[PDB]
Scaffold this active site. Structure first.
Site, short mmCIF file in Angstrom:
data_model
loop_
_atom_site.label_atom_id
_atom_site.label_comp_id
_atom_site.label_asym_id
_atom_site.label_seq_id
_atom_site.Cartn_x
_atom_site.Cartn_y
_atom_site.Cartn_z
N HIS A 159 0.99 -1.03 0.25
CA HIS A 159 0.04 -0.17 0.01
C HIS A 159 0.88 1.17 -0.09
O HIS A 159 0.49 2.42 -0.23
CB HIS A 159 -0.94 -0.30 1.16
CG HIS A 159 -1.93 1.10 1.29
ND1 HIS A 159 -1.85 2.36 1.97
CD2 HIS A 159 -3.21 1.47 0.66
CE1 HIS A 159 -2.74 3.19 1.80
NE2 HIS A 159 -3.59 2.43 0.88
N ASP A 191 -5.61 14.86 -2.03
CA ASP A 191 -4.58 13.90 -1.43
C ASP A 191 -3.21 14.78 -1.43
O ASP A 191 -2.98 15.88 -1.84
CB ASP A 191 -4.07 12.72 -2.08
CG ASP A 191 -3.88 11.44 -1.68
OD1 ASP A 191 -3.17 11.50 -0.41
OD2 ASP A 191 -4.11 10.52 -2.23
N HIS A 426 -8.08 11.68 0.78
CA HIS A 426 -7.31 10.58 0.81
C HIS A 426 -5.80 10.82 1.59
O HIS A 426 -5.09 9.91 1.47
CB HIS A 426 -7.05 9.94 -0.56
CG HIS A 426 -6.72 8.41 -0.47
ND1 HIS A 426 -5.20 8.15 -1.06
CD2 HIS A 426 -7.30 7.38 -0.49
CE1 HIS A 426 -5.36 6.94 -0.96
NE2 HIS A 426 -6.31 6.27 -0.71
N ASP A 451 3.21 -0.35 4.31
CA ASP A 451 3.10 1.25 4.21
C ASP A 451 4.27 1.91 4.72
O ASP A 451 5.28 1.17 5.24
CB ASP A 451 2.02 1.61 4.94
CG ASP A 451 0.64 1.59 4.22
OD1 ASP A 451 0.43 2.10 3.05
OD2 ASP A 451 -0.20 1.12 4.95
#
Ligand SMILES: *[PH-](=O)([O-])[O-]
Length: 491
Positions: A159, A191, A426, A451
């Protein structure tokens, strides 16, 4: 210390994940936020960057994001290292990558390139699309492309959204390279990424080596990895280590903690860690009895996911105020627990001590770029955790209402985009004290993915983040607030 926030986060990380220092988290000095001379805040790669305009006509953010991708890649002399969430880059994101690779090839360079995506024939197809689009530039490029899943039962896959070049420059943040959601739309997703250079870009390269080392080891297991390479080229588990200097050159004076996580299915525990946490007494986070809760009830998971602890420590380091901008604070249960108990406890502890907390999340009308029906799902949870430390529900409500701003995101005066679609956000952003901030891919809602992100301590940069993103966000978003201490709103 000049860096009280990083000092605290670093002390936590060395207790949680000592065995992963260097690879999955690392503190460095000598970095630079990579803005232009004309607009020094434009290291802050927000998109779309069309504040005030419900038609999003002048997308200064998007333009800079795509230009900076191309610029950084075009300056490559040795390596380009990209990770993202599937689908693979398309539209003008892909155009930016292709343009940059052609530019580097034309300056005479021979490159190694890795492109890794997390997912639930696609890699070979992407490789072939890219090679075709590169034309003769492709002769100067050794390409690896892979999609991977590390755990089906724990819903774990990559991710991270990283672009590292030569181990020297890094872009990372929340932005997936999805043209339909970000670009070719009159309701673009909001974002943010950051651009830096320096030793911290090396930290990202070591993180990607960690992921590719696992990926190459599992390349023959069809359930886990789909791999495609140019020509007769092999998988490159340690491209960064093998090709770039172990310590990247210094470029500035900015201190940074790089931090990531290994999710589930790569490594089960850091065997060097002697971390032994106080588990909070849950609460109502596990909607079902049978769910294994890695976020709240798995010590070993924490040791291979230092980013969770890092973000909680960042919150804990705040003396004055905390701003959080996320898609969500809560997850959909099942299969994930609804919330990170320790995070909400850390926010409660700060509000009980008079530290101000702002949370802006994506409009539930998006539910999907939303996982809640109502902001009450956040405020009720905060109130309930506050009650454990303020003596009851009435005192909890008072503390919350005196110290919280809670709202859904807008970027203009209109409640939705002019095309009628709700605003979706986001970001994975936390800033404290107009001093220290996280920008990366790690959501604060429960998630068990690989992540990565950066925690930067620089009041100068933090002030730029306020002026360019957080202040405009609050300007337009405050109209949706259910709680706002600054205006005495308390619903
Ligand atoms: P992410 O790209 O799911 O937050």
């Amino acid at each position: 210390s000049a860096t009280p926030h990083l000092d605290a986060v670093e002390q936590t990380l060395r207790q949680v994940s000592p065995g992963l220092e260097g690879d999955v988290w690392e503190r460095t000095s000598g970095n630079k936020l990579d803005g232009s001379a004309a607009d020094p805040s434009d290291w802050l790669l927000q998109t779309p960057g069309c504040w005030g305009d419900d038609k999003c006509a002048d997308r200064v953010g998007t333009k800079r994001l795509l230009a900076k991708m191309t610029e950084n890649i075009g300056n490559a002399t040795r390596t380009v290292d990209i990770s993202t969430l599937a689908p693979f880059p398309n539209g003008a994101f892909q155009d930016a990558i292709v343009a940059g690779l052609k530019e580097s090839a034309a300056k005479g360079n021979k490159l190694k390139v890795r492109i890794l995506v997390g997912a639930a024939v696609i890699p070979s197809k992407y490789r072939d699309e890219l090679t075709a689009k590169l034309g003769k530039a492709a002769e100067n490029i050794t390409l690896n492309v892979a999609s991977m899943t590390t755990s089906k039962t724990a819903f774990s896959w990559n991710h991270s959204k990283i672009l590292v070049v030569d181990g020297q420059s890094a872009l990372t943040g929340g932005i997936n390279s999805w043209k339909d959601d970000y670009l070719d739309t009159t309701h673009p997703v909001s974002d943010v990424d950051l651009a830096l250079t320096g030793p911290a870009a090396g930290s990202a390269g070591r993180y990607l080596d960690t992921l590719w080392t696992w990926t190459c080891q599992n390349k023959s297991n069809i359930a886990s990895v789909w791999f495609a390479a140019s020509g007769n080229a092999g998988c490159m588990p340690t491209m960064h280590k093998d090709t770039n200097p172990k310590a990247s050159p210094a470029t500035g004076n900015v201190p940074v903690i790089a931090v990531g996580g290994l999710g589930v299915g790569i490594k089960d525990v850091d065997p060097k860690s002697t971390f032994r946490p106080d588990l909070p007494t849950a609460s109502d986070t596990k909607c079902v009895v049978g769910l294994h809760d890695n976020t709240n009830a798995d010590r070993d998971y924490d040791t291979v996911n230092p980013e969770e602890s890092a973000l909680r420590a960042l919150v804990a380091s705040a003396k004055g105020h905390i701003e959080i901008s996320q898609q969500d604070l809560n997850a959909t249960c099942p299969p994930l627990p609804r919330y990170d108990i320790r995070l909400y406890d850390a926010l409660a502890a700060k509000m009980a001590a008079g530290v101000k907390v702002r949370i802006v999340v994506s409009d539930p009308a998006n539910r999907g770029y939303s996982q809640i029906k109502s902001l009450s799902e956040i405020s009720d949870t905060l109130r309930n955790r506050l009650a454990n430390i303020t003596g009851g529900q009435q005192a909890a409500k008072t503390a919350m209402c005196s110290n919280l701003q809670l709202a859904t995101f807008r970027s203009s005066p209109n409640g939705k985009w002019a095309d009628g679609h709700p605003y979706a956000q986001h970001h994975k952003l936390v800033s404290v004290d107009s001093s220290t901030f996280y920008i990366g891919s790690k959501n604060l809602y429960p998630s068990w993915l690989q992540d990565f992100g950066y925690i930067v301590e620089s009041p100068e940069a933090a002030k730029q983040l306020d002026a360019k993103l957080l202040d405009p966000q609050w300007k337009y978003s405050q109209e949706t607030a259910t709680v706002d201490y600054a205006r005495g709103i308390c619903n």
